[PDB]
Structure 1
Amino acid sequence: SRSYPCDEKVIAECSNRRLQEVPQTVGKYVTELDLSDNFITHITNESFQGLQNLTKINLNHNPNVGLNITDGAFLNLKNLRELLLEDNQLPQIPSGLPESLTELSLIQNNIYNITKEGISRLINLKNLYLAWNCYFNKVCEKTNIEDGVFETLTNLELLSLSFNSLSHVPPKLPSSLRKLFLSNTQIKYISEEDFKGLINLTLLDLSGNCPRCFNAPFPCVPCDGGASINIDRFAFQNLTQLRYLNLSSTSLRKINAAWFKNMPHLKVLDLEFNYLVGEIASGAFLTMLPRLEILDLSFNYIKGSYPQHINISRNFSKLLSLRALHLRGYVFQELREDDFQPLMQLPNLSTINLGINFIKQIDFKLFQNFSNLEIIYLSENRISPLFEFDPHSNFYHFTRPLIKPQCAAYGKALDLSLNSIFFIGPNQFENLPDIACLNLSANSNAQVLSGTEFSAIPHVKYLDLTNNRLDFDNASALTELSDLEVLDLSYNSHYFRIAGVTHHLEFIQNFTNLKVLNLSHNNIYTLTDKYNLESKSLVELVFSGNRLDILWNDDDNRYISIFKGLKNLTRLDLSLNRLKHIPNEAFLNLPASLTELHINDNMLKFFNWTLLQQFPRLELLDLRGNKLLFLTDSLDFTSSLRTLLLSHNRISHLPSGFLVSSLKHLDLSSNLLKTINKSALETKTTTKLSMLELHGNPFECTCDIGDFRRWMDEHLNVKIPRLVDVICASPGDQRGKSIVSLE
């Protein structure tokens, strides 16, 4: 049958549905139940009375804008393995939890007391998350950890107590632990006893203890006098399995090399937001990490200091397994070749990260002297022409890839974005490696590209030129990049805005391998001499955020064939072009090779459906966010349409038998359908419709809805998502309830 209120694929997706109590209509065979972001206020032993096969329960953020849990409310669920109770304003750990629990997360509550009565019986616990309960300027209490409360959990592998006021590492920790998170715990001193027996530990996070608070984007409290964290010389002597060490924001001025004497597997060392400029120049500890792969030393700048060069110790040459060196926020003016000599013979160093250093000039000749550089990240510098925090993410840096993977996959990547290379000189890219991926976005480049600017790096396959002010006055622009496959020219509207200047786009045709071209948000409304775009290779063209409403206006025919010359085109995005109307000849001149057409977010008051006959490969047609009022009677016009997106229009009536042929996905949500008559379901053929979206329609829940209700019951192969949002607008006794909950 059709599940309600949840969607059961056995997991029951039942989140964000404005539920006020645990639904009693959940299938008795569900394995995992996700009830997050609902308005649930109480949990008793009757709430999950019929779901004894439950292993995972998600009750995060309830009620959405506290959660009362009775003692033993979960006790009857003897298969409950994972219980997520985040953002519930819980004042205590819930009493009488099932001993079958292996993962429990109480992140972001008001729990200031970790008691034996609450935790010391869940001896099967492997992951325990208690982070973010008392932090910053929250009015809260210092965390009380009963002596030996974790001593019972002999199978505990992960313990997270970060962002609580602990002041001391808890004693009597089980030696089964592999990951210990103690970030922002006000722990000023690490004794020799604190981790004496954790011989299985692979991760240790002591970040944010005695923090560096200058320019902190959060309420920050330094240790007395901004002193360093006090780590005993033998505090790590038995952590021989450690792979991850996070010492970010611990006010370190000196790194004791003896910390790593017995740490042969250390792979990632985080040292952000310290005062390690002197250690970077000396680096006695660097001798001890020949297996280290990632070293983050970012934001160690000295306040008010803008040195001429970066001082990299020669001992960086001992990091023989280094693959990624992160040196953001060191702040220096010039990168000379000899400054990076200690790094030039590392065999696996493929990522160098020098973002946000206010570097004025770089001798790009030095990057060729490297063994295996794959990612050169120089974004956000000063190079000139030649609750607030996600508790489940990294706190001191974003974890997204430095360069988009679609660009980095082509080969070596150079990122010069967010600088002020406002024009490319003739020798800007001399003595560089064979760059395949180049990011020059947001440089305010206003120059006329002619066909020589990228001659020194002619093998670029993916070129990012977004957010500039490029001046297209040469038909030979970018033609020296004959192997170019992806070109991004989004947000270059500066000169396209001005009618009096020339706009030449003819260079598009001089490419044999160009596949992806993005001209979005350029305000294109006039072109010079050649009015048509032409390419025999181009596969995808993104033309959103332009003025096709002007290019195709009724008193102008020069642009009637603007896209016809894109003979290989399969994907075309015409969204956000302010189109109230598409001339029939202009639509008929779109490439017949199209398989995907987006005309969403315009102002289309009418769509000529019969013209679809000239597009036998059209699988996807996107017309969401328009003002369409009518559908065609005999959709005779296509045998290829698999997806029809029509949400946010003004359709008030559905044609007879519309629910067609190869249509598998039909989106009619957010329209003006009051009902779906029996005429629309009087289909001859057997339907292949697998998803039909109808939420947001002002359905009239009288007796006339019964014919469509039975159609739903007959076709359970047609998945109707968000049935809780397919809501009756009429009559008053049904306004607010789902159409599936009537007589």
Structure 2
Amino acid sequence: SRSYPCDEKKQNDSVIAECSNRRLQEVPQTVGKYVTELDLSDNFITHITNESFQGLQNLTKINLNHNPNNGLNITDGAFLNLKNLRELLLEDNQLPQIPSGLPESLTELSLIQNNIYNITKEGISRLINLKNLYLAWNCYFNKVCEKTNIEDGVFETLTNLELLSLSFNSLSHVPPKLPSSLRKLFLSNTQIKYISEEDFKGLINLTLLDLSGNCPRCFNAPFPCVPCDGGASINIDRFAFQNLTQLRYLNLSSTSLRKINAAWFKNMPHLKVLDLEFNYLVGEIASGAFLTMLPRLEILDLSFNYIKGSYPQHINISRNFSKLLSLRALHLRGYVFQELREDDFQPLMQLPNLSTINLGINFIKQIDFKLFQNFSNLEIIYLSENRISPLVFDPHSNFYHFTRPLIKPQCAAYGKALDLSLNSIFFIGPNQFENLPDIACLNLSANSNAQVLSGTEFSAIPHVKYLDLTNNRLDFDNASALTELSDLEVLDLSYNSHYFRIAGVTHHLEFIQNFTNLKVLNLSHNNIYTLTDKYNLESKSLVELVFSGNRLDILWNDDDNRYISIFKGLKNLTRLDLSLNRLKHIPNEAFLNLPASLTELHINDNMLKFFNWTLLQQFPRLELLDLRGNKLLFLTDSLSDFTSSLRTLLLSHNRISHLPSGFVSSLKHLDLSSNLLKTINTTKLSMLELHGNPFECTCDIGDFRRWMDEHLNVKIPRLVDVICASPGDQRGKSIVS
């Protein structure tokens, strides 16, 4: 049978029910008995009783987050009948207290983003099987919340607990009687001003300790904060981390630290990640005794440690940075200094495993680029948001660290990456890339660069494979533009316009024919409406062309039909994006001249009023045709006469009111959602999208309903959104039942 209202899926030897965002006012009683994991998040469920999951005895995981989208009423012992429930997520439910009578079988419990101010034995201590306990964000920057009360010895009985998260709660003191089984202790933003010798003594298995946001550096803080009296730092006793021999992660970000006691690391020889951002450590970076205590540190973050009102000429890096033998990544954003000299970075040049140097947001005016060559194995050189000139919310997130890749993985995958985006490189200077290592990935985005590309600018780094030139004012009309980058595979020219042309802008794309290895070209939002001498693009290697945000309506509306074969020369194109080109219709001869090698064609978000389906005959390899967001009214009744390869047909957000007698053995995905269908009058179809249509739920919908029951292989997603528009009697209800 077809599941409702949930989307049941087979996951790793289990059956899962995706039942989120369905507007459900209560727990559905139509859930499969075989289902073991239930996701009911983002609904209007208001009550959970003993008879809420009565027919679902085999459940191991329940997610009730963000319910109801004025709190969630849960009865005492509502979950007690679920003898195999191991993971219960009750986040953002406005709970006033921890639910009474929770099953002892629980190994993972989350109560994040509630109004729980009393952590009691009555609700926690009976759960001896708990391994992960999340109680963060209960008493944070909000009213009614004064202090979180943690009953003495509540966690003492949880001898299997490996993760305890008490972050964003007014604690003021590290809770006593914590179980020695602990591995991760999260105490961020807990108002803990002092850490004593007895606070973590028993935690000999602790691998992660998060103490960030306690005594925050408030002008820099990501959250509304009150600093410790007199702007004081966190007070950590000399022997606080004395028996934390297994520590791998220590987060001390935004703790107003001015001095770092080197004795804190004497017993952690395995510390791998140390987060020291948002502190006052400019002096400690210059003469850090602690640097000699971290031989196994791989990630060091000393970002946003700038001195308020200061813009020093140089960065002072202690020579003891050379004792960080295991270092893989150094993050030094927001130090804010004017010049980087070759000698300032001498301590780092001996680190054999140093692959990332993060110097973003430093406002560096001058860098001696020859210094980068003197590095063992640099892979990422991140210099975004500096001032180099032409050389002639989610509560489960990391709030202090930039976790996303600094450079796009697709770029970095080619080799040594140099990110010089958002700097003052308004033209490419004659010596711009002098003394640079073998750069394979280069970002020069958003530099206000209005260079006239001639074929000499990138000769100093000729092995660039991926070049990002987006959000600039480049002139590439010379047919020799970028030809010095003979190995170029990816070229991003998005959001580009001539700096001075006001009345007429005529593009010359002859340079593209010079590349023997160019595979991806993005000319999006270049506002291209006329071509110069060569009116038609040519390439033997080009695989993908992104032409969105251009004026193909103007080009293909030419009185002389000059742009009738504009992309015919791209003999190996498999992907073409023609979205956002204001197209009302594509001329039959202009469509027939698209490359026959195409497999994915996107003409979405245009204004197409007509589409000659017959022309699909000239494209035997076309598997995806995307026509969403147009104004099409007719569908061909002879689709199998025009295609035998089409697998996906995307047609949502169009004006289709009639499905013709015929709806193609190749077609697997048919998207007809958000159209104007009132009714639907052996296939190999695996998905049919129909939500958003004005279905008329009279006896006429019965034939289609019978079709839905015979073909259970055809997955119809979002059945709660396949709704009756008429009659008034059925309006709002789903076409099912």
Contact 1:493 1:524 in 2 (8 A): no
Contact 1:312 1:342 in 2 (8 A): yes
Shift in CA distance, 119/65, structure 1 to aligned 2, threshold 3 Å: closer
Deviation track 1:674-718 (CA, whole Å, cap 9, x = no partner) reads 0001xxxxxxxx110000010011111111111111101000010
Contact 1:496 1:526 in 2 (8 A): no
Paired position in structure 2 for 1:680: none
Matching of residue 210 in structure 1 with residue 206 in structure 2: no
Distance in 2, Cα, partners of 1:65 & 1:584: 59
Deviation track 1:524-550 (CA, whole Å, cap 9, x = no partner) reads 111222111111000000000111111
Shift in CA distance, 668/539, structure 1 to aligned 2, threshold 3 Å: same
Paired position in structure 2 for 1:409: 413
CA apart distance, 1:179: 0.1
CA apart distance, 1:48: 0.4
Distance in 2, Cα, partners of 1:562 & 1:58: 53
Deviation track 1:406-429 (CA, whole Å, cap 9, x = no partner) reads 110001000000111011011100
CA apart distance, 1:473: 2.7
Contact 2:535 2:563 in 1 (8 A): yes
Contact 1:643 1:663 in 2 (8 A): yes
Distance in 1, Cα, partners of 2:563 & 2:308: 57
Contact 2:506 2:528 in 1 (8 A): no
Could you tell me the percent identity over the aligned residues? 100
**Secondary structure of the residue that 1:269 maps to in structure 2?**
strand
**Secondary structure of the residue that 1:316 maps to in structure 2?**
helix
Give the count of matched residue pairs: 730
Shift in CA distance, 74/640, structure 1 to aligned 2, threshold 3 Å: same
CA apart distance, 1:590: 0.3
Distance in 1, Cα, partners of 2:53 & 2:283: 59
Contact 1:89 1:108 in 2 (8 A): yes
CA apart distance, 1:225: 0.4
Contact 2:210 2:250 in 1 (8 A): yes
CA apart distance, 1:381: 1.1
**Secondary structure of the residue that 1:734 maps to in structure 2?**
coil
Deviation track 1:237-264 (CA, whole Å, cap 9, x = no partner) reads 1000000000001111111111011101
CA apart distance, 1:114: 0.3
Distance in 1, Cα, partners of 2:585 & 2:122: 69
Equivalences for residues 656-735 of structure 1 within 5 A: 656-658=661-663, 660-677=664-681, 686-735=682-731
CA apart distance, 1:29: 1.0
Distance in 1, Cα, partners of 2:85 & 2:505: 68
Distance in 2, Cα, partners of 1:360 & 1:581: 51
Q: Which range is displaced more, 282-291 or 4-13?
A: 4-13
Paired position in structure 2 for 1:241: 246
Distance in 2, Cα, partners of 1:121 & 1:557: 79
Contact 2:280 2:305 in 1 (8 A): yes
Distance in 2, Cα, partners of 1:676 & 1:252: 68
**Secondary structure of the residue that 1:494 maps to in structure 2?**
coil
Shift in CA distance, 65/449, structure 1 to aligned 2, threshold 3 Å: farther
Distance in 1, Cα, partners of 2:499 & 2:709: 57
Distance in 1, Cα, partners of 2:488 & 2:319: 39
Shift in CA distance, 496/519, structure 1 to aligned 2, threshold 3 Å: farther
Contact 1:643 1:664 in 2 (8 A): yes
Q: 1:616 aligns with which of 611, 617, 620?
A: 620
CA apart distance, 1:138: 4.2
Distance in 1, Cα, partners of 2:95 & 2:289: 47
CA apart distance, 1:347: 0.3
Distance in 2, Cα, partners of 1:235 & 1:345: 32
Q: TM-score, normalised by structure 1?
A: 0.97
Deviation track 1:581-612 (CA, whole Å, cap 9, x = no partner) reads 11111001100000000000000011000000
Contact 1:15 1:35 in 2 (8 A): yes
Contact 1:472 1:502 in 2 (8 A): no
CA apart distance, 1:216: 2.9
Matching of residue 186 in structure 1 with residue 181 in structure 2: no
CA apart distance, 1:480: 0.5
Distance in 1, Cα, partners of 2:635 & 2:70: 40
Matching of residue 573 in structure 1 with residue 574 in structure 2: no
Deviation track 1:339-384 (CA, whole Å, cap 9, x = no partner) reads 0000001100010000001111111010001111110000011111
Contact 1:497 1:524 in 2 (8 A): no
Deviation track 1:273-292 (CA, whole Å, cap 9, x = no partner) reads 00000000001001000110
Distance in 2, Cα, partners of 1:282 & 1:661: 71
Contact 1:649 1:671 in 2 (8 A): yes
Structure 2: 5+ residue runs without aligned partners?
9-13
Distance in 2, Cα, partners of 1:736 & 1:676: 19
CA apart distance, 1:503: 2.4
Contact 2:638 2:662 in 1 (8 A): no
Contact 2:506 2:529 in 1 (8 A): no
Distance in 2, Cα, partners of 1:412 & 1:269: 25
**Secondary structure of the residue that 1:204 maps to in structure 2?**
strand
CA apart distance, 1:502: 4.4
Contact 1:600 1:626 in 2 (8 A): yes
Deviation track 1:624-682 (CA, whole Å, cap 9, x = no partner) reads 00000000120110111000000010111101121x120000000001110001xxxxx
Shift in CA distance, 65/520, structure 1 to aligned 2, threshold 3 Å: farther
Distance in 1, Cα, partners of 2:689 & 2:635: 16
Distance in 2, Cα, partners of 1:141 & 1:675: 58
**Secondary structure of the residue that 2:498 maps to in structure 1?**
helix
Contact 2:47 2:72 in 1 (8 A): yes
CA apart distance, 1:398: 2.9
Distance in 2, Cα, partners of 1:533 & 1:478: 16
Shift in CA distance, 645/168, structure 1 to aligned 2, threshold 3 Å: same
CA apart distance, 1:153: 0.3
Structure 1: 5+ residue runs without aligned partners?
678-685
Distance in 1, Cα, partners of 2:268 & 2:89: 34
**Secondary structure of the residue that 1:724 maps to in structure 2?**
helix
Contact 2:439 2:464 in 1 (8 A): yes
Q: 1:309 aligns with which of 307, 314, 317?
A: 314
Distance in 2, Cα, partners of 1:226 & 1:181: 23
Contact 2:609 2:633 in 1 (8 A): yes
Matching of residue 639 in structure 1 with residue 644 in structure 2: yes
Q: Which range is displaced more, 548-557 or 454-463?
A: 548-557
Contact 1:59 1:85 in 2 (8 A): yes
Deviation track 1:464-493 (CA, whole Å, cap 9, x = no partner) reads 000101112311000000100000000103
Paired position in structure 2 for 1:682: none
**Secondary structure of the residue that 1:426 maps to in structure 2?**
coil
**Secondary structure of the residue that 2:88 maps to in structure 1?**
strand
C-alpha RMSD over aligned residues? 1.1
